[model samples]
Target: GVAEVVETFKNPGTYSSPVINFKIASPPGPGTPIYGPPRDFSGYNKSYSLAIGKTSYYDPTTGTKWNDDTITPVSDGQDIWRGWTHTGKWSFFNGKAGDKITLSVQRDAQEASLKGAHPGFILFWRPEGGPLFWAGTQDLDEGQTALPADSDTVIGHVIVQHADWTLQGLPPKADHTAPAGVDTELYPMKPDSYTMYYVDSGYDADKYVASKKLIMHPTAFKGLALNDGTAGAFTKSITLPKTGYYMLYVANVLEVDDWSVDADGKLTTTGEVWEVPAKGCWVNITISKP
Candidate 1:
């Protein structure tokens, strides 16, 4: 009857920690569950209390909590954030206009044990109108492309993951601070990921991987932080447009270094990592006044 994997943030300034398992390849949705876990992900919406060694997985090497169910399922389509339907875990909060909202997420339990698994977050506003508006994508991959036609950050699936950006830094940090202006107005995060990077010395000097396109807004974000910033890992501060349900989609992402591009600028890679399960982590996310 209600949202399957969503939690309502009634109390502010506190954390509702949960250990969620996100899939590498999630399906996009308009009618579906956004780019979510595969049909075989039996535990998709079923929540069960978990502990490090008791119910959760444990690594044999360093004895960390890690799962081997890497790639949950193959995506029906690629880059499906356009709809931003749903995936990952969700939380909602009510706010009035001009509210200085500061939301943050940090590693928990086995967080200190993982290698590069970092947390990423996307913000969306569900107004009384019906449709939605969203903002995210502080940093993009080296050769990520621009958005599709008539496209904006809210309706495009440009594939921006937390593990890919701030997660790559020392502590894998990210903070998106901006004022929540009117919905009709633009909430720019950064310029599009249209710039190409060279390998410095490699096969093709011009042969770059024009792999994925990240849907981004104009510019002037409060400046996202990573490695080291305000205090913790993923943090975002913005002004509320009005009294509405503000939704957050969060997950820890890790990239698979399986990409190659030709001289003609075509991108290709192997299937997503399904052989080994991704190492999931626990997090404590909170929303408070800044």
Candidate 2:
């Protein structure tokens, strides 16, 4: 049911106020939901309001109203423009090439104000499943350690929740804005447990870094539903109702501490953090049902 002349008043009719929409059509099709959520198609054709924006998040002071008409989930600040999906139309309800599904999003107002090392909000779908769970940026802090302030301010570092770049078709790299070592693919909001590999100082002045391959199972993501998935006083769990094939995304983040002679000719820690920018990828991890 398309409606015409749905009136919306704005301060100045801002440009790039894109408004994209998607109908989670009723009745599950003859398929399953993959990589995305909405596991049961319950909301299909029901028209419960849904939106995505850099400002749509939780805030204690603002209450639930923060999710409306803002660049993000935050309710306090004024948002430029907000709307719906712009890419990957393949999953659209009854979508076809010739069919022009309408979209709504306010670009100029929101995009310009986005901060941090993340990308604009994106729409995802696990067609095989209905009403799946999605974990966006969570409320977690790095503690006493210096925080990674690499946001939209740093041109290349911003991707989604983290900053990433690659020389060839390889893994993305992160230049430690703090110490001096490379923390390959470290998840700031997500708990990152990296090993400290060292080749005793007795060896030559040069050295190489390598360790056991990390494994992140679908069950690993299960616990990541809400909260800051960090190790310190933080926990998460994701439930896989039925066992099946899953994709585990594993990566490596390394830290190297350089040494130098102090004023008394004594060796001391230079405290460097140089990131190798390990490649981020996925592996198929299948969990069999009992």
Candidate 3:
């Protein structure tokens, strides 16, 4: 159904903004959803970005996905069609008193090249290991009913397909794609990318024991040439909940074939570069309502 989040402004504590708006959503779930205005998002326009909640970064002096040395953003430029690559570390998402966190994505070289690849609409990853908590255009107008509206989380990601690897995340020897609308299934291959985790109306990692996904979210988009065991790096983010400030880790599983240009506009090795990102790949985090 449709979930309406309304905020009541009241004096908070000693923060710079002394007043806070208490948000309320219809038929609240485990936690209260932070409130904001409605933000309508459509197909990929340029890029994808999302927010985590109150994450601390560690130093990269150790060259690990996340280190206990420093807290920072892992922003990387993706190749949308070549392969899956690491994007960034998780952080908090931004919102307004009556504002909402708008999920969006940008059409990359693949879609622009007339590939007509449909992006995957995001779903909450079920921690118990099953189908992702997904939604469709029909799921709207009935009032929202996903879990993420209350807590904070990140999109632990994996890429299912590329130009030559459509079968990567797919079932072996299975041609899941059919002639439009002929298949009456619960889900479809509409959006090529998907956001696996959501805080407003999606699955909760805190409650579920473990989870997995076959694709990347529009917000946490990745472009790479290879699929390796590295996709499992986030297996830890699922465990050992943070106490206050904690160390973050990140890693990329590659096949030494994905290639692209560097920040200097020079051609870099394919699937060889493994390090921090340049932009938009970093994770954003948020905290409990103020």
Candidate 1, residues 153-192, lDDT tens digits: the string is 2221121221111111111213322335534333223222
Q: Give the RMSD in angstroms, all C-alphas superposed, for model 2.
A: 24.6
Per-model TM against the reference:
0.35, 0.15, 0.18
Cα lDDT listed for each candidate = 0.29, 0.18, 0.22
Worst 10 residues of 1 by lDDT: 195-204
Candidate with more favorable, higher lDDT: 1 or 3: 1
Best candidate, lDDT: 1
If both were scored by TM-score, which would come out higher, candidate 2 or candidate 3? Answer: 3
lDDT of 3 by residue, 1-290 (tens): 11111112112211111111112211112233433332211111212223111111111111212111111222331222211112212222222223322332222222232211111222122121222222221122134344234222222222122111111111122222323432325323433222222222111111111232222222223322122222211211122111111111121222123334445544334333223222112221222221
- Number of clashes in every candidate structure? 15, 62, 66
Kindly list the per-residue Cα lDDT of model 2 for residues 25-142, writing each as its tens digit.
1111223322322212121221121212111111111111111222232332232111111211112221111222222211123223221111111222111122111111111111
Stretches of candidate 3 above 4 Å error? 1-39, 43-145, 150-156, 160-182, 185-290
Error of 3 at 150 (Å): 10
Error of 1 at 242 (Å): 2.2
Error of 3 at 40 (Å): 3.7
- Lowest lDDT block of 10, candidate 3: 13-22
Residue 265 displacement (Å), model 2: 38
